[PDB]
Amino acid sequence: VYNYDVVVIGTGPAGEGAAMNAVKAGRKVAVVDDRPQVGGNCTHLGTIPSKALRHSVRQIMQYNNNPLFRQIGEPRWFSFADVLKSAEQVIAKQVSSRTGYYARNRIDTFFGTASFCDEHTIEVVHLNGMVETLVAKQFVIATGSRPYRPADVDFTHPRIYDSDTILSLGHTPRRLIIYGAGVIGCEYASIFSGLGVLVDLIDNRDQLLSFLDDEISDSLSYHLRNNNVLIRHNEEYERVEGLDNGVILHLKSGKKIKADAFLWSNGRTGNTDKLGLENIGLKANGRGQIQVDEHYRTEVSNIYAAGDVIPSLASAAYDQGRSAAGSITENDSWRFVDDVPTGIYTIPEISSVGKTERELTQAKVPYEVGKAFFKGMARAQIAVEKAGMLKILFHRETLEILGVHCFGYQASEIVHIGQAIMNQKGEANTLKYFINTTFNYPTMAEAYRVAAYDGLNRLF
Amino acid sequence: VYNYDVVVIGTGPAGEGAAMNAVKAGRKVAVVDDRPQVGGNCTHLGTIPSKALRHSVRQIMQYNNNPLFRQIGEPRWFSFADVLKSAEQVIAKQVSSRTGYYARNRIDTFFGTASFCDEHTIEVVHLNGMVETLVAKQFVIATGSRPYRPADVDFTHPRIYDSDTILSLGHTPRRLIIYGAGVIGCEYASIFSGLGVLVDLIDNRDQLLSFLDDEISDSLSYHLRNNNVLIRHNEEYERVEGLDNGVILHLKSGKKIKADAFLWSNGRTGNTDKLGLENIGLKANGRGQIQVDEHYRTEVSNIYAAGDVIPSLASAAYDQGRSAAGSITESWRFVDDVPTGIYTIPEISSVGKTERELTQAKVPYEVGKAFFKGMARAQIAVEKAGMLKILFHRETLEILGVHCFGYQASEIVHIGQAIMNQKGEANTLKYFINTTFNYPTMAEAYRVAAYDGLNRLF
Amino acid sequence: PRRLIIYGAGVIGCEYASIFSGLGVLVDLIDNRDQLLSFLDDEISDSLSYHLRNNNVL
Numbered sequence A: 001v002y003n004y005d006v007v008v009i010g011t012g013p014a015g016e017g018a019a020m021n022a023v024k025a026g027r028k029v030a031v032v033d034d035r036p037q038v039g040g041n042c043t044h045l046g047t048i049p050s051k052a053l054r055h056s057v058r059q060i061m062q063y064n065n066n067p068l069f070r071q072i073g074e075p076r077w078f079s080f081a082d083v084l085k086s087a088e089q090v091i092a093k094q095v096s097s098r099t100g101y102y103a104r105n106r107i108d109t110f111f112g113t114a115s116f117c118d119e120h121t122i123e124v125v126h127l128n129g130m131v132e133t134l135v136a137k138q139f140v141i142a143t144g145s146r147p148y149r150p151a152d153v154d155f156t157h158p159r160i161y162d163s164d165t166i167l168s169l170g171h172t173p174r175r176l177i178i179y180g181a182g183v184i185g186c187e188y189a190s191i192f193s194g195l196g197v198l199v200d201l202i203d204n205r206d207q208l209l210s211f212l213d214d215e216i217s218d219s220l221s222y223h224l225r226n227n228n229v230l231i232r233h234n235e236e237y238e239r240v241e242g243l244d245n246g247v248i249l250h251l252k253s254g255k256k257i258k259a260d261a262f263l264w265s266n267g268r269t270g271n272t273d274k275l276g277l278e279n280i281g282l283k284a285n286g287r288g289q290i291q292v293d294e295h296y297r298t299e300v301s302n303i304y305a306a307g308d309v310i311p312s313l314a315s316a317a318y319d320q321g322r323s324a325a326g327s328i329t330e331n332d333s334w335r336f337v338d339d340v341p342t343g344i345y346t347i348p349e350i351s352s353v354g355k356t357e358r359e360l361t362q363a364k365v366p367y368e369v370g371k372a373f374f375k376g377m378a379r380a381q382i383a384v385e386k387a388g389m390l391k392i393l394f395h396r397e398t399l400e401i402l403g404v405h406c407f408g409y410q411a412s413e414i415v416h417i418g419q420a421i422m423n424q425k426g427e428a429n430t431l432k433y434f435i436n437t438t439f440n441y442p443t444m445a446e447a448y449r450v451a452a453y454d455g456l457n458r459l460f
Numbered sequence B: 001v002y003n004y005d006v007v008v009i010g011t012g013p014a015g016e017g018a019a020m021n022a023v024k025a026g027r028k029v030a031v032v033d034d035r036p037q038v039g040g041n042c043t044h045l046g047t048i049p050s051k052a053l054r055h056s057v058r059q060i061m062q063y064n065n066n067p068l069f070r071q072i073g074e075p076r077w078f079s080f081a082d083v084l085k086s087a088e089q090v091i092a093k094q095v096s097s098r099t100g101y102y103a104r105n106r107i108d109t110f111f112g113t114a115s116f117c118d119e120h121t122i123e124v125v126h127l128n129g130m131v132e133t134l135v136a137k138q139f140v141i142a143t144g145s146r147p148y149r150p151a152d153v154d155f156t157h158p159r160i161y162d163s164d165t166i167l168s169l170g171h172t173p174r175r176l177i178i179y180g181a182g183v184i185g186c187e188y189a190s191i192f193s194g195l196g197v198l199v200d201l202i203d204n205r206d207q208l209l210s211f212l213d214d215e216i217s218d219s220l221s222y223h224l225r226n227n228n229v230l231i232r233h234n235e236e237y238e239r240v241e242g243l244d245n246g247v248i249l250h251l252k253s254g255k256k257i258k259a260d261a262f263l264w265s266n267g268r269t270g271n272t273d274k275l276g277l278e279n280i281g282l283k284a285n286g287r288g289q290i291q292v293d294e295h296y297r298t299e300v301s302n303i304y305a306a307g308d309v310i311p312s313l314a315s316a317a318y319d320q321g322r323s324a325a326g327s328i329t330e331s332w333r334f335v336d337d338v339p340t341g342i343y344t345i346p347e348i349s350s351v352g353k354t355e356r357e358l359t360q361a362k363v364p365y366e367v368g369k370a371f372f373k374g375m376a377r378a379q380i381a382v383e384k385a386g387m388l389k390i391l392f393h394r395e396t397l398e399i400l401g402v403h404c405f406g407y408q409a410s411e412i413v414h415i416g417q418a419i420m421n422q423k424g425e426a427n428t429l430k431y432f433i434n435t436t437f438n439y440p441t442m443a444e445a446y447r448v449a450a451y452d453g454l455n456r457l458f
Numbered sequence C: 001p002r003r004l005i006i007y008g009a010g011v012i013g014c015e016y017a018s019i020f021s022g023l024g025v026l027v028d029l030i031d032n033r034d035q036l037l038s039f040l041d042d043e044i045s046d047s048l049s050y051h052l053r054n055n056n057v058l
């Protein structure tokens, strides 16, 4: 039996941020997770592995399309195992760094499944048979989520995978079917298209990423189509059948598609069933999520939830966990993480912040559009990333930025300047900043300047 | 004899920006250049070729050190010509884009050397012997500069190069000597270190880039030393001897260094000799620069000078030209706070006061550090060396200086610059705690740095 | 002209927008619907919109 001030369940970004913020306040913190190593889904099955796969695919594509390396020989494909091999060193380094972060602050860890006993007591059970009783005054729930698994899909089939088991692939398939047009599905479709796999992306809606700007979605769809990705719209699956050599999907519309593999990316379910929320009066909705208020507080006053258990973004989860820890400690570090810069790490990347075009049109705001195309950008030309764009929506009278959308090379790393300018108050948030500020050159931030001018010419 | 409201000399960033801002005002503009193509040194001989060389060398290094590509075969050294070949497509695209920009706004161009006659006319002299007369109410001077050529150096020797003709190299040398520890010198030292050339960098001072922070300079020096860049400090050249099989530099201290090539990167002199400034009474200093006020206006009321002809940065020159054009048409700012950027391997960028200036001013500041080795994006980019430092006021949390060195340093520094320019309490460190970034990116490094500051704050 | 505005996303409007964009003028096509030529295929309309936007047709 151990006693602590605050106990956090799950060692993902939310749990790590909550524990670090709470221990920074002078309290005693503990962390519980079921994985054999620290890091959570973000490092072991989420952000890090898929991002390493994407970066390796991009490097392979650039090497193949670079004439300088064509003197070495004819273009050569790479096995999926060799591509995935690069992620092991990165995940090992990340887990080592996180363990060092925990150890340097004297943070106690327990590597076992956590179950609830009462409002202040939990039992951690390891695989071997640890049965340790933990009592804490404050609780943080950061158990994340898992891929949604419908019953009628034989996930035990060797040729059917989800967003987690897809990394178990040993050989590169010739054909692939991806279901669900979510962020994960689009990212994996882009990665496998870069690898050279004819993948037939399936969408339940008519437009990919309807929450994004219409032009950005159109450009992404066109690029995917030009990159061997076949996009089908307004489709719902009827039956998935595994075979010896492939997987056949029968849609409700009547189309039957056969591939050499299958990936499911349609939604996620909260990983809270094993916790046993009935011992504290808490309940989980149909998606497995936990309802929280603006203070990230559950129905129980001393129990808090943050992260994927409620935009399902790793940075958003980390900030939500830190805010929940601040609410626990009440050290003027609480904030409701609501404005999250949307980022899709396809090839090329996509990012957005603030209002889109359709919302502005619906609200009848007198705005204007400033565009800067990456094809004319020195850095984009020099990186051989010719495709791309940057769009700035700015108020036509007050010159206040209402939304920034970018699609191309280094989208996420240049959306941040627009985000910083947008967050300013009143006249401080002005497009004219991009004219009265000297940037570097040749970089991607220079596009902002061009975009600004492309707005100012449209202003009379 | 043509007539326009405003004429521009030089088609670099300063001239292009001045012309664009002037034509935006509804006036009539003209441009003159002595090169057969538009763009200036920013595209033809300066920024773009060196950046292309840097990106190609970085890609070569990434391919060489990547275990995935090693299965194909053993590393193969790439000739300098093949590496430089990638720049031709980029310069062609840039010049086509700039020509389209000029033609879209109906901008007249004159491909010839410009000479002054009086305060309202100039003569354009072509290669085959013309004079064309141009008259403008307002004048913009953006003649830029050229590499400084001392008399005692035989630049006509095939084995002796400057910052311009170094691109004429056809074979990769084994050993190379760089004189001058300037931005260009350090950049080219990094380039040739990436290509496996035993560079012997020569510095006239004791510390590389003394205008930078001590920590950043020390890290850059350590990386260069680990990348075969033998750095010699406090050295002044005495004589240069060009052999058939090499170049031997005899220093004032008595050291004699032999290489297979030689590169001079010590300073630049403004292009004012052939401008005929004596026809207007304007005066240029020994450095070839033109003195202007805060309006970017010369002593003559209707003559303006902007750009490298006066921080010598392409973006700074472009903004200076646009500011001068705005001053002509009345939308004007003085380009003073230029974020310094050195595009070596890895890159360096900085904005605001350094730690030494803050110590001298006795401002009670504090340091927040975020090391790239622990950064997920840096680890996944295989580029682990690097750091990001934020200097913030201890009491009011006001950011007084941002320094970054590593991967994507120049693009990273822009967020800190954007926060910096805010007024009063808006420019606060706690912004990095009150905003969610994209992950995994290097921008998250800022967040870490902020926390590394807040722990030191009590 | 230096700039131009086209109202109506019909066949004639799109043809003139493409022609003028080829001529090198910033055309601002205005549509009463959410998709250009909704009676066409979605992929074809998306490709046409991408090309027009890439050719200064806002």
Ligand SMILES: Cc1cc2nc3c(=O)[nH]c(=O)nc-3n(C[C@H](O)[C@H](O)[C@H](O)COP(=O)(O)OP(=O)(O)OC[C@H]3O[C@@H](n4cnc5c(N)ncnc54)[C@H](O)[C@@H]3O)c2cc1C
Binding pocket: A009, A010, A011, A012, A013, A014, A015, A032, A033, A034, A035, A039, A040, A041, A042, A045, A046, A047, A050, A112, A113, A114, A115, A142, A143, A144, A145, A163, A184, A271, A272, A274, A275, A306, A307, A308, A309, A312, A313, A314, A315, A316, A317, A318, A345, B439, B440
């Ligand atoms: C392929 C892919 C790519 C992604 N890319 C991005 C991206 O680029 N950016 C982004 O922001 N997000 C991305 N995500 C989303 C990311 O996975 C989540 O945002 C993030 O993992 C949520 O953080 P969290 O700490 O709140 O939850 P998690 O990190 O998922 O926390 C779950 C942890 O709790 C443990 N746990 C769960 N239940 C129990 C239990 N009963 N007992 C004990 N331990 C338990 C798990 O073992 C795990 O360690 C991606 C996801 C996927 C699948």
Ligand SMILES: Cc1cc2nc3c(=O)[nH]c(=O)nc-3n(C[C@H](O)[C@H](O)[C@H](O)COP(=O)(O)OP(=O)(O)OC[C@H]3O[C@@H](n4cnc5c(N)ncnc54)[C@H](O)[C@@H]3O)c2cc1C
Binding pocket: A441, A442, B009, B010, B011, B012, B013, B014, B015, B032, B033, B034, B035, B039, B040, B041, B042, B043, B045, B046, B047, B050, B112, B113, B114, B115, B142, B143, B144, B145, B163, B184, B271, B274, B275, B306, B307, B308, B309, B312, B313, B314, B315, B316, B317, B318, B343
């Ligand atoms: C190797 C190298 C790398 C560099 N890298 C960078 C970098 O990464 N970032 C950065 O910001 N800066 C960089 N620079 C500096 C960059 O070259 C200058 O900042 C830039 O030239 C400034 O613009 P400008 O128009 O004043 O210069 P220029 O472009 O040189 O303008 C001068 C133009 O006018 C013409 N001209 C000159 N004299 C006359 C005359 N008498 N009559 C008519 N026309 C004339 C010239 O032919 C030229 O076209 C680099 C320079 C070098 C040499």
